[PDB]
Amino acid sequence: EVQFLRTDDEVVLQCSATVLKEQLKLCLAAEGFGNRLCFLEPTSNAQNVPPDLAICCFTLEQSLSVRALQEMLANTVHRTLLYGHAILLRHAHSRMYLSCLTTSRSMTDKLAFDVGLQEDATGEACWWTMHPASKQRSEGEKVRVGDDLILVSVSSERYLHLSTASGELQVDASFMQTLWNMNPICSCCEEGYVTGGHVLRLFHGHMDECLTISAADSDDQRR
Amino acid sequence: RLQESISDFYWYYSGKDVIEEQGKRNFSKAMSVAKQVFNSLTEYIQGP
Amino acid sequence: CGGERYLDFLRFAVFVNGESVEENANVVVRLLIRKPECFGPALRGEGGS
Amino acid sequence: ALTEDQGLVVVDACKAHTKATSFCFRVSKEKLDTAPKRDVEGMGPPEIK
After folding, report:
1. Residue C36 is nearest to which of A108, A157, A175, comparing CB atoms?
2. Cβ contact A45:A21 at 8 Å
3. Nearby residues of A220 by Cβ (< 8 Å), 6 or more positions away
4. Which of A53, A44, A41 minimizes the C-alpha distance to A162?
């Protein structure tokens, strides 16, 4: 697979740091409605606890160049990716745009804007660029399946980093470096077909019945 | 690389409707080289 | 002593004549904070002091 | 999931045993479908609609 990702393909971040035992796989996720800041979901130990992929998935929208992005953002009112391109990532569930914030935490100066979903795409702080991160690849080359890379915010010069601070391995846009890997999910498929991760109704008969659970506020637990 | 270089140079004068004299010479310099590259590629194929 | 007399060259390469060259200041500023172990990282807020 | 003592239930993700939670979609429930294979990381062939 050449990993075309022709501007319509679900993607998930799959980077981690060797901290506890073996760099336990953590995926960036967010819920949107509620706390805007993103968090990390463990996924390597899926056998004991299943991962929460409903709110973890991200989708790709645009892969314009840096100068193309500058022109587009100056004048506002299917294609494979190329290394060193501005990227546009949207949250699949909440339909918000992944971006950075204008505030920091942890009580230390350590200038690092928090990473959180944005209500609207505009704001100049939403796009990211996949810059060279390893000698195996070079600027101006393609991107492969599971190719590790570094993501740099267009506005915030700080990189997207898995800040393994005193907390539970938070993600912050500090001036560190970590090889953020991207793994693919469903893409352009056959119309009206089954797909892993699709919320579906299991219907029996024409209009007889369907799989259900006891209604809310039931006398017994809804098990 | 030359194609990517000129395409990036294209996304510099797209907004502006006037091309400066310095920009005109740079465009001529790159295109005059691209033609020479194209001719060399043809000679590798002619005489099939 | 070594650090004080080392960046004095950059003070002349970024302040040409009563102005700030934007073609080099932007590159210099990125490089200053590119490595956190700079500008006396022990007691400049980078190490927490 | 199937808790093996109360029948088919729905369990929390905190205590979701792999064997109990794992299910399968098939057709012609007999014939004892063979072991899985063909681990392809692509889109895959057409399937049920």
Report:
1. A175
2. no
3. A214
4. A41
